[PDB]
Amino acid sequence: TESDWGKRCVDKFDIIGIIGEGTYGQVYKAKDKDTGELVALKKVRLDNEKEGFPITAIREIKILRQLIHRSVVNMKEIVTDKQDALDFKKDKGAFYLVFEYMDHDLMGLLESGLVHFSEDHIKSFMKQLMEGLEYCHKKNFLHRDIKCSNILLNNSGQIKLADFGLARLYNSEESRPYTNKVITLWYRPPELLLGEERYTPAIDVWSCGCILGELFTKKPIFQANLELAQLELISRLCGSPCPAVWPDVIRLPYFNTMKPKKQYRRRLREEFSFIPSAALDLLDHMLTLDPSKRCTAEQTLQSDFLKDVELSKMAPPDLPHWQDC
Amino acid sequence: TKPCWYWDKKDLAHTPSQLEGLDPATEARYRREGARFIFDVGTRLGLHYDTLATGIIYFHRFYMFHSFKQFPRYVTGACCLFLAGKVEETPKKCKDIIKTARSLLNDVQFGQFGDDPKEEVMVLERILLQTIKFDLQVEHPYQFLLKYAKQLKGDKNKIQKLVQMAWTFVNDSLCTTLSLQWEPEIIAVAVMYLAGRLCKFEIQEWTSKPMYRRWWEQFVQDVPVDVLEDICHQILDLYSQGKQQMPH
Amino acid sequence: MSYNYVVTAQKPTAVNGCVTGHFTSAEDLNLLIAKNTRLEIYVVTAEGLRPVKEVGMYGKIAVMELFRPKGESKDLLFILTAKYNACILEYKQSGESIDIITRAHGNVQDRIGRPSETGIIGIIDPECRMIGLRLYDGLFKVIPLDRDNKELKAFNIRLEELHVIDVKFLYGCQAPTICFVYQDPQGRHVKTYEVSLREKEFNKGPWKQENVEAEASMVIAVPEPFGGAIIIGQESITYHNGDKYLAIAPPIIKQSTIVCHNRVDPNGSRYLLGDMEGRLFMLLLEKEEQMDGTVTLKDLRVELLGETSIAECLTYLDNGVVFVGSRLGDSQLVKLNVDSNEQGSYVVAMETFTNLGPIVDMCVVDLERQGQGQLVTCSGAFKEGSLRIIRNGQKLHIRTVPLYESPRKICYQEVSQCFGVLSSRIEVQDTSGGTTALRPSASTQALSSSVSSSKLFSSSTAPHETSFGEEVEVHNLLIIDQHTFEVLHAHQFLQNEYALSLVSCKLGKDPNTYFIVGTAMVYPEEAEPKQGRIVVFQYSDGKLQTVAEKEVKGAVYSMVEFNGKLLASINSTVRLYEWTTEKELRTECNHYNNIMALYLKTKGDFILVGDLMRSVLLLAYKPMEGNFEEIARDFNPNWMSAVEILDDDNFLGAENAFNLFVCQKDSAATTDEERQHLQEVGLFHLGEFVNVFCHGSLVMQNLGETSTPTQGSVLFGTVNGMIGLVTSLSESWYNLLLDMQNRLNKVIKSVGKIEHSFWRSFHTERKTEPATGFIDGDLIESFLDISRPKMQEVVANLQYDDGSGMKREATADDLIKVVEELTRIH
């Protein structure tokens, strides 16, 4: 049946080329010999035998078979290398993860500067992203790795989130120590910079705001090589962490340790004056220092900017074209 | 989309272990031992109750597809617990599981692990994952015992006694094939039903529908008493066969 | 790691901007000409221009303006680079010693902002109170010109109008006032604001907004006698000033877009306008004085003067002399006469300044047979289209072959003693239903000619409507003699067929040498073409005869011969063809893991493929298997403009952000993945847009030439006419030259006080990295031009490594000899 994963052999797919090197394993693009559908196969290596199956791949399998959403990538099945006949101990064959193929990734599209986003394009992109995030946050899963590279877009204009390797469940009643500083520095929230280690779903929201601003500027908002410098850059725009704006900032481990040069005032509305008013309000709420005062995914969907966006019209972005070349 | 992980009692007469000449009593004993081995090893390591159960469910499912004569149970058990730890985010190093397994097993039993215990376990993970069809997410009677108990309102002490007694019944059912016969939701109801009979409590009174004598139907739709009785019979059999008695 | 060397063989020639004023002395009339990264200073005479000084800047010159603040005797120069380096410059001369003073400087980049579509705009107040900058959408940046602002500190004023087309400061206003054209969903408008340095915001402007032409392009600030502004469009010219409104819409200007403006008469009576077809117009402002004594604007008139080169900048100098600054063709001095000549023209050319124009393609071929090597470049566009044959003699000798149509690709075929050139000329839909060419050109003046009769796409049934006046490109193949450079033959490709690739080679067991062209069917409706042709021609006995045609389902972006087989890139596919004994192409193997295969290069059985956004892939053909295999890819995303193979492990690429990088195989065979990751080991900001990379050396190559430290030779052509040479170094030679750069940068004074390390830093809108693996040859070659005290200061405590002597001190005479050998490469 369709549910018996791990038995079908990777022979059933013809490899076209390696799309990308995943951090845990390489990802290749292939065609299902039977249907012709392009799929993407991620190589999970059991050869290390330090910890057997990588837990990062374990998390992606556990979670993505639970999560069903247009804005969440679908793992179709898991296939394996030709296994050694009747000798599992000798067998070192790797396992490959079947996923839907994506024409482009957001990080690549921005770096080539080949895309021009209108407000309406952003509306459709953001509405899909938040709806996906809301679905996942409602199921009480935290992505913890929101990045431009991880956002995947098909030419049609549909967006699906993909790299759930660092994702874990959140218990509001019993918050427990999690992996600290999970998100990449450019898109990391201030609470993680201060090491909350017991973070809420609002960490993913911070990153998506950084994306929102980046779609309007075509440049990442906060680029730094050091955790302190990122805090400084954030502090300049969003304001310095201070007890009045973040009552519980004093409980965070590095608040006294990590300090901005000055107690900067918030300038977000001034520096993003070119952003439309409906969107600017979304940015101010998404980029709020206090995770408790930071908006939720549902609140973003019920915003003037996104509430009245219709998903029927997905507004495809100015995609790379031959005249552009 | 998703696999079927439930069988009929009659079907257990045809496990690979049975057809290779193992009799029903021996496979039952072999399961209790393997499950309890998983339970004891993980308890020594400080593992959450879900992690212990997940390993046990992997273990039970595994020997529906394989024979106990070709896969030593204790190695399989250890492998199940190792994977369960990664699935449920309570990870342990394989070497530490072996260390504990050696502490608890005698010399004959630890002989199953062969010359290199860690290797025999890490190798099996491949077969385990393919066997359980990479369906790693598992629900357990525990969460439903608490979700349903939270909707009971009445004497605080009588309900807490019901829960703990039922909770004990859940832990005991992990030694049986009930995990393979009935969804966890039904198990949670059955153990509520059993504890109620034993404590002479009438649970309907604590529900929002106190005149609904079939109190469970608001928690679990379409469950005849037939099922809850079959389950209770199977749980109490373990106590009657052993020397242990009902907790009360 | 990899070590490479880049030297500027020919400096940028295209004129990017030009101004006049009193910069060198309050008395002289100056002409400052801006070429990319280069500033040329001239003094105007009665015969022409006297050059006085040339400086290089560590940046692309984006803004260039002259102004004279109260208290200064002579004009000061403002320049802003494309990386937002701002500075104010002064000319100072002490007898024979000429130097440029950096009076103020700073970097005006904002942390958060959206770069504008119409680019950086820089303007200065008529009272020289402030410098206005339009760098980002929705923001206006003001640098106030007070004596104390030596760092050019500035503030932003929120601007409601997000999409600004052009802006100028106005004359005759009570306060500093800006006039600009902007675009919103309702069309284009003209609007005014007042700029308050005291309040640091805009105040309501002197006159109301007016709706203007949809394609309103340029704002002309009219001088005090009239005041107000003129708005130039595609069809109309309008004058705005409070209650006054004029509009002239002469049919002559609708034909060609007007791109450049200059003031002839300081009072504004007469202005000069130029258009993309090269026509020069005189704009006349007709005055009417009232009995009040007030001068008003009565009417506007446009008069055609003649033809110049398509000009990026015009500047009237004096008498009848105008300088024509051209980016697409050669720049010029022309004289405007009061009386027309017998052809009706008032314009007569005086001097012609070589501009290598856009170098679309080029080939290095030893035409002389001396072993030297000549570079024939496809240069210019439209009327300025030319083939330029370049040889070294100390200056470069350049010959120009006029084509009067755009050249696209070039390749040399020795067997036929001729070149093949792909061309495109512009025709316009005419009343016959066909098209008519604006001027005769190479493809129409060929000795013999032919038109393709292929019926591959003839089934059509796809409608493409034509409106009178619309432009079309007609692409042709030119067979051009290598000695006379006479067009021997021209083949017109099919209607709506554009020629994209061209090669000359023998295939298989076929002894004939063919011209092979790859084309694509271009229809305005399609974003990406879905039809294409590969065509095999033979040039024989003065005629071009078609041998075979292959239908492809896309655009043949690039082709290259591969060991008797034809390697072609069609859209997302890379395909290898064999040439059968039946003289027909046959598909052999395909590769599809490319978004768009724009560029191809081969060495042995290795293939380097350039993608639009996926950098480069190292493909290989395995003969035993008969299929392609991906060896390694550069996963970091870049926009490629040209690629080249340096050696079996190093690969060179060019980015659309005026950047260069070099990838190498990780060569660690531990994991298969490491081999597959092409690691970018070289990063460099050239500052030019590289279109073509070609192996070869222009400098004379003799067996007797002293072997230079540099190994290899790749020449590259650019959009601004700059030609450069890339070559490799040993680890030892790199470290020596790198250590010397850091010493030279501390010693050499930069114009605008721009840090050299910042200038060469790899720079995209999203990223900035320090340069690596590259030696700025020009910086090394400047050691020979610094004074003796500075030379000795550079060599202090300088040690050599990995040589005959492990540690060896350097003297100023030792390094002079080393650099002098490095200058012999170009």
Ligand SMILES: CC[C@H](CO)Nc1nc(NCc2ccc(-c3ccccn3)c(=O)[nH]2)c2ncn(C(C)C)c2n1
């Ligand atoms: C693994 C890391 C990447 C990046 O962060 N993540 C990712 N990207 C995907 N598609 C986007 C994309 C990438 C690369 C190319 C490409 C590159 C060169 C030549 C041809 N093609 C492309 O065209 N599309 C995708 N599609 C499915 N997956 C996972 C299996 C869920 C994906 N995972």
